[PDB]
Symmetry: C3
Subunit: 177 residues, 3 copies
């Protein structure tokens, strides 16, 4: 139990098939659907329906959280109201794999310009650091203004997150205390 966690999951797929007859309905419905916390993702999967008619299966990824069923019903109705569907199907995950994680803002200086990079550190009970991941968009965007390559920012930042230090890119240093 002190490797990967494997627990019951509150993730579900909410699924409905729409005729492509109602044109700007799906983009609009998705934009309202994502406004709520528990909707993780939306995708309209293109499909062939019954009289060789093009459809989309609207697929909504939902984190139920503490109470799934209130959340599932709220989203199901949203789907119904927003799309005109009267049949929304629900698919539950049989379990979720997880590792405890935390975030760590790492201070980056280049002599005269500075940033703060988010670093997710995923660590098990046993002390296995499975991932230390500096947020890449910040790393590459620093990698521009500095010039020096994005992945060396990443490597330095992640090593700084390990010892709780900060990065001086100008002298190639990680400073602890």
């Amino acid at each position: 139990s002190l490797g990967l966690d494997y627990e019951p999951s509150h993730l579900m797929f909410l699924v409905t098939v729409l005729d492509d007859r109602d044109g700007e309905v799906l983009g609009d419905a998705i934009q309202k659907l994502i406004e709520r916390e528990e909707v993780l993702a939306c995708h309209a999967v293109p499909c062939v329906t019954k009289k060789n008619r093009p459809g989309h299966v609207l697929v909504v990824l939902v984190d139920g959280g503490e109470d799934p069923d209130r959340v599932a019903e709220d989203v199901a109705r949203d789907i119904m109201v927003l799309t005109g569907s009267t049949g929304v199907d629900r698919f539950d995950a049989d379990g979720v794999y997880s590792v405890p994680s935390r975030f760590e803002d790492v201070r980056v200086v280049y002599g005269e310009r500075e940033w703060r990079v988010s670093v997710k550190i995923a660590e098990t009970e046993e002390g296995e650091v499975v991932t230390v991941k500096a947020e890449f968009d910040e790393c590459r965007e620093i990698g521009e203004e500095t010039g020096i390559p994005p992945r060396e920012v990443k490597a330095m930042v992640e090593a700084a997150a390990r010892v709780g230090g900060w990065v001086d890119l100008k002298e190639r240093e990680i400073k602890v205390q």
Copy 2:
């Protein structure tokens, strides 16, 4: 129980992975697959298979209806016969959200030209009309020949479905009796 219905579902995903080695097999198989009532949708999802080979996961959305298993088996064999697969996997929905609905043909006149528009009215036990949806393709296609915008056809038709009347677009009227 007199809001949304949440009942056991006879919807299933029939899933098989195909090598892209057999070229015009998938379009043809889908065209035969959709010929039966209970196949709701088909999509070949592009995927990366095992020796960096491109595949498709053929995904068939099936309404089992009264007896799922006879329907599921018939479709599974069709998939097998049509594609050469010998392994078809089945994924059942854990439940379906639903609202009772009915259809209502609304008579539309523009002085000298007329149509009939299908309007789905979805209404719960409590009397909450969650959706009144005029079929959009008809609404926009009327919206052409008339000139006047498709969504005002929609709004007028849906209001006519509410009181069981008919639409006179020429004088901007909904007539009840």
Copy 3:
């Protein structure tokens, strides 16, 4: 029971939602993911995430085989290590439809050039040969060098697999013994 087999399935979908923030992570992760036997397919499904941000739901199709849970966990960790995700969800098939199958190499000669074509023969207990499928890529690629159409190679090869013979395309013959 001597038609289609319908047995418990060791197939699962491993699902994780990624921000598109980490750029060349998905192609690389998929290329490592497919290296193991039990990963059947990988696809990153494009999706709309929470602050109208584009995401992908990485979807990994996994044959658990004899022990699913060791295989599932190994893949889940791979997903976690390779992508930085700390939440991998698991969806089990409710059953698999199957027909016993075997392969049969069919010798093809055109007077002076020869090949061996793989033919899958799927046959039930009752003796229903549901599919006899010559591997199409070989059939069409023979169909080139020979000139004569790919589907007549297929038909001849499949008929040869039936009687355990071999194909002489030059004299239009299937020879048994």
